With several copies, the nearest count.
Chain A
Amino acid sequence: LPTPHEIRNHLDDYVIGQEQAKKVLAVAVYNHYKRLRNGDTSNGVELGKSNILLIGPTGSGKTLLAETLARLLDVPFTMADATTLTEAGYVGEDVENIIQKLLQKSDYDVQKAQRGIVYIDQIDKISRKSDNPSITRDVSGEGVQQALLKLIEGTVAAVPPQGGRKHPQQEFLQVDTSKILFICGGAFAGLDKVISHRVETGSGIGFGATVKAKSDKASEGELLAQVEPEDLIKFGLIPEFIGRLPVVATLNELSEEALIQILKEPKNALTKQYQALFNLEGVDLEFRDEALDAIAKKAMARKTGARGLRSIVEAALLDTMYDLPSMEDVEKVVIDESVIDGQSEPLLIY
C-alpha cells in the first residue's frame, strides 16, 4: 500500500541532504510489505529477499532513519549490536539473543516477528582481523560472520517465550527467519584509503600526489558511491557474507549548513520543541542565523556533533529558563552568537 514516492516524502521531513539512500530503502521496504502481504502462491514462488547494507560516517543519522521509519511504520523495530556477539558459546553473547529481543517489541507474537525489521550497528567492528601467528581462530573477527550466514538466509531457532515464569513452562517457540529483513550497517574505518588506491589516482604522502587538504572542506562521500563487493574483501569481510547483502547505501555526509536545516525544517527540530514550550507562556523564541553558525562550530569541534546539539542548546537557555517564570511582561526572547560562546546574556523584550 505505501507508495515509494509517499514514503520518501514522509522521510524527507525527518532526513535532510540524503536522497540516494531514500530511493534504495523505499524500494526494499515496499517490496517487503508486498512480499509478506501478497501470498505469492503463483507459478513463481519463494521470492528472494534483498537485504540492505547501510554504509555511512558516524553520527550521520543511520539510527534515526531506522527509528524514524519505525515510528510511522506499523511493524516493530529493534536496535541490536554486533560487537557484543561471541561465537561458539563464548563469554560475550550468543547469537540467539537477537531473536528474543525482537519478541518483546512484537508482544510475543510470531506472526508479528516476521513483519518487523531488525537493525545492527558497528558491523565494521567485526572485520576479519588478519594476524597470522596469534590465534588463527578470531572469535571477534571472521568467526562471527560465519554464524550470521544461516541466520540471515533463514532458519528456525528455539526461543523461550517471555523467559518463563518458572521451570513449569519449559517450552520454546519456533520462529522463522527467512521472511525477516535484516539491515546491517556500520561506519567503516579506513575504507576511503582502500578505494582511493584502486580507483582515482596516485595519491598519498608525496608532493605531486593529492594531499588530504580537504579534510573538512570537502566530503569524502562521493568516493563511497563507487564502492563494490571486491573492495570489502580487502577490508576483511567474507564474500559469502557480502552475497547475503546485495543492496548498498552511501549516506555521504552531514554538512554544517545541513545542521541549520535540521533545526528548522524537521518537525522534531529542537527549535520547534522549545518554541512550543515558551509559546504556552505567552513568549516567543527567535533564533538568528549568527547564533546557528556558532552552534555549528562548537558541535563540529566535539566528537559526534550531530548528537551534541542538545548540550549546547540546553546550556544556553538553562539560565534564561530559570528566570522566565519569575519574569513578567516579557513577550519575546532573542539569542545572539555571543550568548552561545557564553560571553553575553540573551536580550529580553518587554
Chain B
Amino acid sequence: LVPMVIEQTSRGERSFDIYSRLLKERVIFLTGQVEDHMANLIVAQMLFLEAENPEKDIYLYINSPGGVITAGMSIYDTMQFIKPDVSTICMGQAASMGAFLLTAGAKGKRFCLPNSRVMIHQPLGGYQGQATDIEIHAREILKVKGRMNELMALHTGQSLEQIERDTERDRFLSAPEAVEYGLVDSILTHRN
C-alpha cells in the first residue's frame, strides 16, 4: 500500500502519491534488485525531468542489493549524457552495481549515510553449451570487468590496478572508509 497526500496550490487541492510527490522535486527512488523493468522506469523519470528543467539538480537515493549489469549500465550512460548533475545518496546498502551508480554521480554531490554499507565484487555469470560458445561468453564478461574497473577508477580517482585487486572478492566498505577511498564526497550526519 502507498499513502496518498494532498499538495496545496492556489488553483486548488491536488492528490499525489508519496513517490509522485517526491518526483515533483526531482527525486527518484531506486529500491530492490536492478532488473530490466525497474531500470527502464528510472530512465523515463530522468528524461521527464530533463525536459521540465535541464538546469536543476536531481537527487537519487539508492537502497538495493544490486542485480543485472546490463540493466544498470543503461542508467550510468544516461546520467552522464544529460546536463543536470545527478546527486547520489546511499541508504541502507549499495552492492556492486549500486556502488557503480553511486560513484557515477556528479563530483562533489555524492553522499553516504553514517551507518550505510557498500559492497563491491566482480561480475558474476555462467554458461552451458559447447566449448566454443563458453569461450565467447567468457571473453565478453571479461571485457565488462575491465570496462567496469576503468570507470570506477575515473570517478574514485584510484588506479586501475588498485580496483582490480580490491574487486577480486567481496569487499565491504564502511561509510568513513568510502570517503577516504574517493567513492563519495561527504557524510550527511545531521541537518545544517
Contacts and interface: CB of A to CB of B under 8 A. Distances in A.
Interface of A: 124, 127-131, 188-191, 194, 201-209, 211-213, 215, 234-236
A129 B12 contact: yes
A331 to B, nearest CB: 46
Interface SS, A side? loop
B51 interface: yes
Interface string B9-48: 1111000000001101111000000000000000010011
B191 interface: yes
Given A129-B11, A212-B54, A205 B191 contact: no
A202 to B, nearest CB: 4
A207 B8 CA distance: 21
Nearest to A213: B54
Interface stretch (B55-63, B96-104, B129-137, B160-168): B55-63
Given A209-B59, A215-B55, A204 B27 contact: yes
Nearest to A141: B11
A80 to B, nearest CB: 22
Contact of B47 (A129, A207, A215): A207
11 contacts: A124-B10, A188-B10, A204-B22, A204-B26, A205-B21, A205-B44, A206-B22, A206-B59, A207-B59, A235-B10, A236-B10
Contact of B83 (A206, A207, A213): A213
A208 B61 CA distance: 11
Contact of A130 (B12, B24, B89, B191): B12
A129 B48 CA distance: 25
Contacts of B24: 204
A208 B109 contact: yes
Given A131-B12, A212-B54, 6 more contacts: A127-B10, A201-B56, A201-B57, A206-B26, A207-B89, A213-B191
B150 interface: no
B25 A202 contact: yes
Contacts, number: 79
A206 B12 contact: no
A205 B111 CA distance: 17
B47 A206 contact: yes
A140 to B, nearest CB: 12
B47 A205 contact: yes
B10 A189 contact: yes
B51 A204 contact: yes
A131 to B, nearest CB: 5
Which of B11, B26, B89 has most chain A Cβ within 10 Å? B11
A215 B56 CA distance: 13
A194 B48 CA distance: 18
B64 to A, nearest CB: 17
B36 to A, nearest CB: 18
Nearest to B78: A207
A57 to B, nearest CB: 16
A190 B8 contact: yes
Contacts of A188: 10
B10 A209 contact: no
Which of B10, B27, B83 has most chain A Cβ within 10 Å? B10
A205 B25 CA distance: 7
A207 B111 contact: yes
A114 B22 CA distance: 53
B170 to A, nearest CB: 28
B83 A208 contact: no
Which of B8, B59, B89 has most chain A Cβ within 10 Å? B59
Contacts of B188: 207
A234 B173 CA distance: 48
Which of A129, A189, A207, A234 has most chain B Cβ within 10 Å? A207
* A-B pairs, 9 with minimum CB distance: A204-B25, A130-B11, A202-B56, A202-B57, A235-B10, A206-B59, A206-B27, A205-B51, A127-B10
Nearest to B24: A204
A209 B21 CA distance: 14
Contacts of A127: 10-11
Contacts of B59: 202, 206-209
Contacts of A212: 51, 54
Nearest to A236: B10
A2 B191 CA distance: 53
Nearest to B18: A205
